[PDB]
């Protein structure tokens, strides 16, 4: 009931460039009164799952830090963005913790991220030697070695670049179309509350 300066949710949900899945562009939503009713006026969403909290009771809760990471993911891979899920884009690109307290918002972007010849600017990691820890990020493009012969930094017959493209085309059926995902998180570990509701 004392809204002063709403958080820039329109700078997170309504943006022209969304990063790849191995990048996050995490934004610290802080030092501003958060009105969680503005998220419903940006676009028609296709997935809205709040793990731990309630979408209606989000307005009357205080937190120490709210984060908002965004990335473009395939349609068949939205089901992997969930606490305790295994998969290609859930073990090597984005691992949500099993104690996740937040919301995962996903919506289609076929009219903005699909050119007739396919857009190869959205890259995804296929495999690593290990699995990512919760909330970890890898931008290293070290060439993979699928064989017994060492690879001296050149993509060859057995040496592979770790990042592959999606190739989003408008003719692909629903499932291979771009889906922009904005995962909201909340922290209350040890800090004063600075991100409250309209109050």
């Amino acid at each position: 009931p004392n809204i002063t300066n709403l958080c820039p949710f329109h700078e997170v949900f309504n943006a022209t460039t969304f990063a790849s899945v191995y990048a996050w562009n995490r934004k610290r939503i802080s030092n501003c009164v958060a009105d969680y009713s503005v998220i419903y006026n940006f676009a028609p969403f296709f997935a809205f799952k709040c793990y731990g909290v309630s979408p209606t009771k989000l307005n009357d809760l205080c937190f120490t830090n709210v984060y908002a990471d965004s990335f473009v993911i395939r349609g068949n891979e939205v089901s992997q963005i969930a606490p305790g899920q295994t998969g290609n884009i859930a073990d090597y690109n984005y691992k949500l913790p099993d104690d996740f307290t937040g919301c995962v918002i996903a919506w289609n972007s076929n009219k903005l991220d699909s050119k007739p010849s396919g857009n190869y600017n959205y890259l995804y990691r296929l495999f690593r030697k290990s699995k990512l820890k919760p909330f970890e990020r890898d931008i290293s493009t070290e060439i993979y070695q699928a064989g017994n012969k060492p690879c001296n930094g050149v993509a060859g017959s057995n040496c592979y670049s770790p990042l592959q493209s999606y190739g989003f085309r408008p003719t692909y059926g629903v499932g291979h179309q771009p889906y922009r995902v904005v995962v909201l998180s909340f922290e209350l570990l040890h800090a004063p509350a600075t991100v409250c509701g309209p109050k």
Partner: single-chain antibody
Amino acid sequence: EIVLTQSPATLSLSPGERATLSCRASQSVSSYLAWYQQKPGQAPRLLIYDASNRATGIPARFSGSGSGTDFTLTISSLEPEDFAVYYCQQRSNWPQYTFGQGTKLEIKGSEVQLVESGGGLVKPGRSLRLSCTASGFTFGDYAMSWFRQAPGKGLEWVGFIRSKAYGGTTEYAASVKGRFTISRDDSKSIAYLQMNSLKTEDTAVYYCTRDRYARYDILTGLSPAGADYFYYAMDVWGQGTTVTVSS
């Protein structure tokens, strides 16, 4: 630039014998040698890959060795039907496969399949259009390379299209650049090859082959010496079309 030269030219060894085949290399290439066998009329078949590993299906009498600038194929057993031309192939330059003039050995002195189409006289209407339809492996997770073989001249490189994963880009050779364009139709699992501005020297038998498996996840646990590694990550040649010329 890496020229591979075979030392023997025509081995007339009788069966119940041995056989030796050498191969030099200008630049020091690692264990990226693949020996091919080509019966007259048929398509090349891979005998040895990685210069030490044998294929899945061929007899064990093809032990090859060598590494660096000198390789050796030693058929140290009898030759029942070893009458064929034995080529070589380097893969140091991954999109730039270069072969070598093979040796002609004589006697004395499978659901994966990709068929081709398109051929005949081309001098009238100097623009051909080839095709290559796959029926086994899931077309889309592999790159597709093209090779041509002039009449009694040997194998050559044309170009290739990378898989949808690592960009749909292309990389042609020097003699087919600016004229030959390759494109894919992954929805229909068919690869194409345009032949605009056809010349007289393009009267070869063209082949479409597979390339590296874009999915290196499955290629991790597999040892690069077994039958499962050969089935997923290795070239699968097809039949051959023809192109002609006139006045």
